[PDB]
Design a protein around this ligand. Structure first.
Ligand SMILES: [Ca+2]
Length: 218
């Protein structure tokens, strides 16, 4: 399968990422609360549903939520401001709340069966969001005696996510706090800045973007 790319909505950020977030990859976006990481997840959940000429992959979305960050009204807003049907865009997002780290791991293992079901349809899954990758692991595995089990379980979880990305030709997008690593920070005037770091086949760099009624854009 040739790698597909989903536009972030920001031309500057897309350029930094080599065209958009990639299928067959995990993109891991770091930042503090309000940094833009969750706004970017909501934007991508709309963009991926568009045709390739408009920056999408005609795809369905799966959203695994660990910190109650998914906002259906934000999806509706982004969809409408981009001239799309809000009800239709929302219907193509399969939402699952993860109650703890073990459940989060199970949901990703169970996702394989769901991906197979839409694989040869008009709207195969093309994007899996995990917002956030680590909140449950950090809340549950505190201190020295818990570190080994936490790193082993997180490494297994990441392997399971990579397997989904590669087997079903989807982009996996996950958020984190301090894979293709992007770090977000506050810029000037409410702008946000993304920095791509340690990418094997993309140079490091930065992109400035805005959060608007359309989600993310330059
Ligand atoms: Ca955010």
């Amino acid at each position: 399968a040739t790698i597909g790319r989903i536009s972030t909505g920001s031309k500057s950020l897309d350029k930094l990422l080599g065209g958009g977030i990639e299928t067959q990859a995990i993109t891991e976006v770091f930042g503090e609360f309000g940094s833009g990481k969750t706004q970017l997840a909501h934007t991508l959940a709309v963009m991926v549903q568009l045709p390739p000429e408009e920056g999408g992959l005609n795809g369905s979305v799966m959203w695994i939520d660990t910190e109650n960050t998914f906002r259906p009204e934000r999806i509706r807003e982004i969809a409408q401001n981009r001239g799309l049907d809000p009800d239709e865009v929302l219907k193509h997002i399969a939402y699952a709340r993860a109650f703890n780290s073990n459940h989060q791991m199970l949901l990703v293992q169970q996702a394989s069966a769901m991906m197979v079901e839409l694989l040869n349809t008009d709207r195969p899954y093309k994007l899996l969001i995990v917002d956030s990758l680590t909140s449950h692991f950090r809340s549950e595995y505190i201190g020295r005696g818990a570190l080994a089990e936490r790193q082993q379980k997180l490494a297994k979880h990441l392997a399971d996510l990579h397997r989904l990305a590669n087997l079903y030709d989807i982009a996996v997008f996950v958020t984190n706090q301090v894979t293709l690593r992007v770090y977000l920070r506050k810029g000037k005037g409410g702008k946000r800045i993304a920095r791509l770091i340690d990418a094997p086949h993309l140079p490091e760099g930065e992109a400035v973007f805005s959060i608007t009624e359309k989600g993310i854009e330059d």
